[PDB]
From Swiss-Prot, chain A:
Organism: Homo sapiens
Residue span relative to the full protein: 94 to 172 of 172
Name of the protein this chain belongs to: Centrin-2
GO term, biological process aspect, one: nucleotide-excision repair
Family stated for the protein in its record: Belongs to the centrin family.
Additional remarks: Binds two moles of calcium per mole of protein.
Subunit structure: Monomer. Homooligomer. Interacts with SFI1. Interacts with CCP110. Component of the XPC complex composed of XPC, RAD23B and CETN2. Component of the nuclear pore complex (NPC)-associated TREX-2 complex (transcription and export complex 2), composed of at least GANP, 2 copies of ENY2, PCID2, SEM1/DSS1, and either centrin CETN2 or centrin CETN3. The TREX-2 complex also associates with ALYREF/ALY and with the nucleoporin NUP153. Interacts with USP49. Forms a microtubule-associated complex with POC5, POC1B and FAM161A. Interacts with CCDC15.
Gene Ontology cellular-component terms listed: 9+2 motile cilium; apical part of cell; centriole; centrosome; ciliary basal body; cytosol; glial cell projection; nuclear pore nuclear basket
Gene Ontology MF, one: G-protein beta/gamma-subunit complex binding
From Swiss-Prot, chain B:
Subcellular locations according to the entry: Cytoplasm, Cytoskeleton, Microtubule organizing center, Centrosome, Centriole
Family: Belongs to the SFI1 family.
Domain statement: CETN2-binding regions contains a conserved Trp residue in their C-terminal ends, which seems critical for interaction with CETN2.
Protein name in UniProt: Protein SFI1 homolog
Free-text function comment from the UniProt entry: Plays a role in the dynamic structure of centrosome-associated contractile fibers via its interaction with CETN2.
Domain of life: Eukaryota
Phylogenetic lineage: Eukaryota, Metazoa, Chordata, Craniata, Vertebrata
Region (Interaction with CETN2): 1-20
Subunit structure: Interacts with CETN2 (via C-terminus).
Residues of the full protein shown: 641 to 660 of 1242
Gene source species: Homo sapiens
Length: 79, 20
């Protein structure tokens, strides 16, 4: 069945990544994550910011580059 | 649900898809 014919989830994810990455550093850090949390205005308790980064790869990168963010998004590949 | 007048919101889509 046809749904998304476009490729531009990569564009979405890239421009989303840049809305976290203020620093233009190529990483979403904990700080960038919490800076996003206070931009939405959601009163998160630091530990779930830690969970979100810990989820998005302490195995290889440590904090979150675009491939880790792509991995965290592509986790929903019908899931 | 980010339907009418997309001034901002859609950082929510990125953040909330990660946390929730």
């Amino acid at each position: 069945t046809q749904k998304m014919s476009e490729k531009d989830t990569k564009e979405e994810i890239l421009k989303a990544f840049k809305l976290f990455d203020d620093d233009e550093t190529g990483k979403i850090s904990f700080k960038n994550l919490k800076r996003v949390a206070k931009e939405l205005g959601e009163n998160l308790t630091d530990e779930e910011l830690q969970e979100m980064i810990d989820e998005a790869d302490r195995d290889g990168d440590g904090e979150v580059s675009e491939q880790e963010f792509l991995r965290i998004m592509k986790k929903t590949s019908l899931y | 649900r980010a339907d009418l007048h997309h001034q901002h919101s859609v950082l929510h889509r990125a953040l909330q898809a990660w946390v929730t």
